[PDB]
Amino acid sequence: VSKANVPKIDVSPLFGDDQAAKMRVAQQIDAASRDTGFFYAVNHGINVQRLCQKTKEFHMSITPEEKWDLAIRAYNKEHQDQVRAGYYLSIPGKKAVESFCYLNPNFTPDHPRIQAKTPTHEVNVWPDETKHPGFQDFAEQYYWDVFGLSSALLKGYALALGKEENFFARHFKPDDTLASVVLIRYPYLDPYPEAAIKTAADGTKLSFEWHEDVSLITVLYQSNVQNLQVETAAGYQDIEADDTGYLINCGSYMAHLTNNYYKAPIHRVKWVNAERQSLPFFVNLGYDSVIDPFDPREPNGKSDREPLSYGDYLQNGLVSLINKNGQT
Template sequence: MTNLAKVLLKGFALAAGQDEHFFDDKIRVDDTMSTLRLNYYPFLDNIEAVEVAEDGTRLGCETHRDCTLVTILYQPIEGLQVEDDAAGWIDVPPSESNFVINTGALMSRWTNGVFKAANHRVKFVNMERVSVPFFTEPYFYCPIENFTPKNSAQSLLNETVIYGNYLIEANKKIKEYQN
């Protein structure tokens, strides 16, 4: 998965006007913070949704943006929705042969907002299912110095931070990691 992530990151770097190798030294196999999770959701009698959204949708996972550069997701069962500013919540079709790629808050920060973090949620589906996300992250002490795209008058938005410190602060806002 790390190799796939590195290929994707080359494309993101080029699309943002940077050298294709911009992220190469930040995603290091020997000390990356990248994480592969296997999420198993069994069918359970009498279980309730984690939360009910403002629009009345019952959720199995709260609305959030990943803290990562990109998340590569295998999700063969329906449930994932992404938010579109114009269209609202859009169902992401499940697939057993494709990945879903979400840009994360770190990608947005690092690219000075060129790429927006995908706001997403998972509808409550009480059935046995599996999802497998790969959260692409740099090494703990990696300096996050956002860049201004070439040919842009946009000023820098964020100060340089160390990734590990950024991650610790970002995780404090996620319900799953509180308490």
């Protein structure tokens, strides 16, 4: 197995006002997006030093009682409103991964989309503050920290595609973003349950099968344990780990609106028997957000593709991925 070219891009100019410097970042984003589709954002300003400990302590200190109490509808029939947000339980002997997903903190009972009962909007559920001191505060602040990084990155992607820097970010708003954080624990297990290991067509043992992301972009922090592979014409290539940077790639919403100029890279998760933490942030727009497609390869930039409303895209995408690659 070969190794993917995944450049480390200093994204700090995207927070500044040096426009030429922003363009030089955008060129690097362009080149990565046209190559394997992945790059590492470095010099990003987020304090990642404790992200792994908090995630691990939360998952290791939360009890079975609390997991049922926070469980999404797939694990608890009593929680019909928790489709996206809540705890995703492991199944000892069968399923190793466990996670906790939360959405926009501004989705409260008073929010208009919650009052309208619009799909994909949910009020977050949280554990008991006394049993998990500071956890909710940490998690909500992290949401906005990675929101800010994602906003800057979206300015880089817009410039990379020849647009003004707010072409994407203008649709990415704290009041309505459908973006999500998932705090994933991949455990060390001995023996490791065979049922939790899938064998790819090429024989590689996997924890999660090939897929394109349901997102505009995906902004991921992970522990320093190599596991991701990206598919190229020459086969799957290993993505090296970097527990200081954020791994960035496009989702299928970006591929659609660019007439596949920036593809949504197909990737998968190798099985590795090692305790590790994964914290993806799925950059989703608002429910009614629509971006007019275009084709940067054509002189006139025109695309025949239908503009897709983001909320319908997300509803269709999250169900499709569950069907192909299983309930997580």
